[PDB]
């Protein structure tokens, strides 16, 4: 059809589950079909993303085979896409494509990994290998992000302490979510005295490795109601999805870096246009946050504050918090009320899915102690890949 | 940008090339760009497929980074897709989609691998790994198709020598191609005397490991004419693209195998229906042929002979060859005039690219000693990944 909604959501718990990637992927898919009032047979496509713990040739085909989705009710398109942490939204965009071009009317999007159970040595070897030719000291991704952090300090006047604040705010958010890995909030000093991983990035500022899988069912507005029917927020309209890209790793000069290297605003800029919406009208933001500089660059890009003022955005919330509890009220910082990759958890390419599930929870008034009030009608979700290498942004709204 | 063409084509040599996968991709992309009278700056997207020799997280981003596609001028979306050997055709559709929604005005599609320079030991392990949990005896990939072959032999009455006839015919096409790995034709008796690999699979019935890369530039017709202007066949219109899929490996019973598994039929009908053409408008077929059972299944699925009679299709074509030389006349067998994966060469996920490049040569009356006369106006190309797991079909036309 033309209007396409997220019609089902299924996920496993997050943490150390001691289960294989195929085991996790299958469970998330069985939950999502139950949540959508569907059977396997009612699905006509699947897009999935690669797993770091269990790398696999034709992963979506491998997952779809092992989960027993075959034989199928006719044609059945299967695809695997790799854009790193931007993946789940990229695939959500393709899912809309398949429904719009009528190659399939319902699409499942799956992300699954087990990078916590894999062990610190294995995760390090595999994640660091992925960045060959970067010239990045180990750990490569944190040092890769570490470099952009350091470059930001000198061009825009960002403060080191503004970095360390990013995990403070996410921790405040995490403790109202029972499933989040971080259940005890951090202090700004706790973060700074944490074991140094890269020069301006400490341990508590790194994404929180976790196992987990999430599945989404995507369907056409018209198609779904006649066979399986606020199912606005609860089964939101995907208004738009858009992408943009950049280098897989930063330049080796520490400078020569330029504002167009960062790729998030153009993805966001495009998603608004397809949706006929804009930023002041978005009141829940799910923003990728693998390291402090990643979340900082993001709030600029979707349009919550001007370029360069991203460190300032966090502090006013951190200050607004300190002289108020410190209770971080969602409604003044309606951003990553789940804790993000910092404090909810980060299964490699999976965790952008958690921005989507938290968008639906806020939109469906299912956010508990974390509920944004008044309830937002529209949400923005963001996934980022590599080291600012892939950006894809979606717009989810309850009502048209 | 309504009529969409392959605006550039570049490829490296094939063989044992003593080159990295990134050198090949970069060399082919610069060739494809020279071919279009374009520079790096004119690209607005990049799509690639994974490499077995140099497996890489976010493979396409890695290529564009190392090859220096960054920093970029205006919008440059990058994605990696894995549908196995179906990838280049899967990717061609994404490229066309990207052109229609104006998410990018010019697209590079890149496939590069080096499974020959990588060594025979490594090729066996990594390819065997791909079918983990299948239960297929090693080597796994040959053993899997082999199973469908006996199912063909036992369901449709297919015979051993009719399978073995495929590489004879492919050797004949290959000997007229200056680049093909195989430079001297086989006898049907030598293929049958070839080293037994699986029950119905001999050494000469297997794809010929090779290094190589091919790049395509896809753009809108007017756009190419309005910004960069045989300008038909040499830069053909992509008339249609479609896909369908199946299991990554067989159930392992031969009695669980059913005609409804195969997806080439589903892919072909949609490519036909979407182009508003049918088999009669096509006079060249580039058909993925990793093993005889694939080419046999393909010609039936596309409609060159009834279901089950694909081995008979080969026998009647091989017989006529003998009754002319034995000279294989193209017009009696307008299929894989370059030699295919059997005898031209097969760099893992790349060789569907060779079906397209041989289609362009045929369409442009530049196929030399293999040239079909009268010049074909339309071709159908087909790629396969895994074990009848992915089907991708395209249709290219010279002028509308």
Q: Where are the domains of chain A?
A: 1-400
Experimental method, per PDB record: X-ray
| A242: contact with B, CB 8 A cutoff | yes
The pair phi, psi for residue A344, each rounded to 5°, is: -80, -55
Residue B21 corresponds to which tokens in the numbers above? Answer: 């996968």
Cis geometry, peptide bond prior to residue A326 (ω within 30 degrees of 0): yes
Residue of A nearest to B244 (CA): A77
Phi, psi at A31, each rounded to 5°:
-70, -45
> How far apart are alpha carbons A294 and A351 in whole angstroms?
14
Q: How many CB atoms lie within 10 A of CB B164?
A: 27
A1-400 placed in CATH 3.40.50.80: no
Residues in chain A: 400
Counting other chains too, the contacts that A361-365 makes at CB distance below 8 Å and 24 or more residues apart are A362/A233, A362/A284, A362/A334, A362/A337, A363/A232, A363/A233, A363/A234, A363/A236, A363/A284, A363/A396, A363/A398, A364/A230, A364/A233, A364/A234, A365/A230, A365/A233
The bridge status of strand B378-385 relative to strand B285-287 is: parallel
Q: Note whether B58 contacts A82, CB cutoff 8 Å.
A: yes
Which residues, numbered 128 to 147 in chain A, qualify as contacts with chain B under a Cβ-Cβ cut-off of 8 Å?
A: 130-133
Tell me which chain A residues have a C-beta less than 8 angstroms from the C-beta of B390. 58, 61, 78
Q: Identify the helix (H) or strand (E) that includes residue A384.
A: strand A378-385
- Is the minimum CB–CB distance between A386 and chain B shorter than 8 Å? yes
Window 68-87 of A, Cβ < 8 Å to B: 70-71, 74-84
Asked if A259 has any chain B CB less than 8 Å from its own CB, the reply is no
Between CA A328 and CA A321 the distance in angstroms is 5
Cα A200 to Cα A165: distance, rounded to the nearest angstrom: 13
Distance CA B311, CA B320 (A): 14
Residues written for chain B: 400
Residues of B in contact with A80 (CB under 8 A): 81-83
A153-167 as b/e: b if 16+ CB within 10 A: beebebeeebbbbbb
Of residues A61, A248, A270, nearest to B386 (C-beta): A61
Around B106, how many Cα atoms within 13 Å sit in the side-chain half-sphere?
Answer: 26
Q: Is the minimum CB–CB distance between B248 and chain A shorter than 8 Å? A: yes
Q: In 10 A of CB B135, how many CB atoms?
A: 12
Inter-CA distances, A353 with A37, A109, A331, A350, A356, Å:
20, 10, 22, 6, 5
Binding site for malonyl-CoA, residues of B?
Answer: 85, 195, 206-209, 288, 386
Q: Supply the Cα-derived Rg of chain B in whole angstroms.
A: 20
Query: Cβ atoms within 10 A of the Cβ of B385, count?
Result: 30
CA closest to B257 among chain A residues: A71
The tokens of A268 are what?
């966001």
**Looking at the partner chain, which of A59, A248, A261 has a beta carbon nearest the beta carbon of B58?**
A248
> Alpha helix (H) ranges present in chain B?
21-35, 59-66, 87-100, 120-129, 140-155, 160-174, 188-192, 221-227, 264-275, 292-302, 310-322, 340-343, 352-363
Is A40's Cβ below 8 Å from some Cβ in B? no
Is A57–B386 a contact, with Cβ atoms under 8 angstroms apart?
yes
d(CA B221, CA B325): 44
Which residue carries 């009719």 as its tokens?
B162
Q: Chain A: residue nearest B22 by CA?
A: A133
- Residues A336 and A350: their CA atoms lie apart, in Å, by 15
Sorted by sequence, the CB contacts under 8 Å of residue A316 that are 6+ apart come out as none
3-state SS class at A393: strand
3-state helix, strand, coil in chain B (%, to 5): 40, 20, 40
Smallest CA–CA distance from B82 into chain A, residue: A80
Residue B276 has which token pair? 């508003």
User: Are the beta carbons of B72 and A130 separated by less than 8 Å?
Assistant: no
Q: According to DSSP H, which parts of A202-286 are helical?
A: 221-225, 264-275
- Asked whether the CA dihedral B204, B207, B213, B216 is positive or negative, the reply is positive
The contacts found for B196-203 with CB under 8 angstroms, 24 or more apart, are B197/B139, B197/B142, B197/B146, B198/B142, B198/B143, B198/B145, B198/B146, B199/B146, B199/B150, B200/B146, B200/B149, B200/B150, B200/B153, B200/B160, B200/B163, B201/B142, B201/B143, B201/B145, B201/B146, B201/B149, B201/B163, B201/B291, B202/B164
If we measure between CA atoms, which residue out of A296, A291, A320 comes closest to residue A309?
A: A296
Dihedral, CA of residue A3, residue A6, residue A8 and residue A13, to nearest 10:
170
């Amino acid at each position: 059809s033309q209007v396409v909604r997220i019609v089902g959501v299924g996920r496993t718990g997050i943490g150390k589950l001691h289960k294989s990637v195929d085991e996790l992927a299958a469970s998330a898919l069985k939950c999502a079909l139950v949540d959508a009032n569907m059977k396997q047979c009612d699905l006509q496509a699947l897009i999935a993303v690669p797993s770091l713990a269990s790398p696999q040739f034709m992963q979506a085909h491998h997952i779809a085979t092992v989960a027993g989705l075959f034989p199928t009710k006719g044609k059945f398109i299967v695809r695997t896409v790799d854009t790193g942490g931007a993946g789940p939204i990229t695939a959500l965009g393709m899912a809309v494509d398949l429904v719009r071009t009528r190659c399939a009317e319902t699409v499942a999007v799956i992300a699954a990994d087990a990078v916590l159970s894999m062990g610190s040595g294995a995760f390090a070897e595999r994640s660091n290998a992925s960045l060959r030719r970067s010239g990045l000291p180990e750990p490569c991704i944190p040092h890769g992000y570490d470099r952009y952090a350091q470059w930001y300090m000198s061009r825009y006047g960002l403060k080191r302490e503004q970095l360390a604040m990013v995990p403070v705010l996410m921790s405040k958010m995490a403790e109202r979510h029972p499933e989040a890995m971080c259940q005890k909030a951090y202090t700004l000093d706790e973060v700074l005295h944490s074991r140094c991983v890269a020069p301006v990035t400490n341990l508590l500022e790194c994404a929180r490795r976790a196992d987990g899988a999430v599945a989404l069912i995507v369907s056409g507005e018209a198609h779904y109601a006649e066979h399986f029917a606020h199912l606005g927020g609860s089964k939101p309209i995907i208004a738009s999805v858009a992408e943009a890209s950049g280098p897989l790793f930063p330049p080796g000069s520490s400078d020569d870096i330029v504002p167009d290297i960062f790729s998030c605003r153009h993805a966001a800029r495009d998603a608004f246009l397809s949706a006929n919406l804009n930023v002041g009208d978005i009141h829940f933001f799910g923003l990728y946050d693998c390291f402090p500089i990643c979340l900082i660059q993001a709030v600029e890009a979707v349009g919550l504050c001007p370029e360069g003022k991203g460190g300032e955005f966090m502090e006013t919330a951190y200050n607004e918090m300190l002289n108020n509890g410190g209770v971080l009220d969602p409604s003044k910082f309606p951003i990553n009320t789940h804790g993000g990759l910092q404090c909810f958890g980060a299964p490699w390419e999976v965790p952008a899915m958690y921005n989507i599930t938290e968008a639906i929870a806020q939109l469906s008034e299912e956010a508990g102690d974390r509920q944004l009030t008044p309830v937002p009608k529209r949400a923005l979700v963001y996934g980022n890949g590599g080291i600012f290498s892939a950006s894809s942004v979606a717009i989810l709204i309850s009502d048209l």
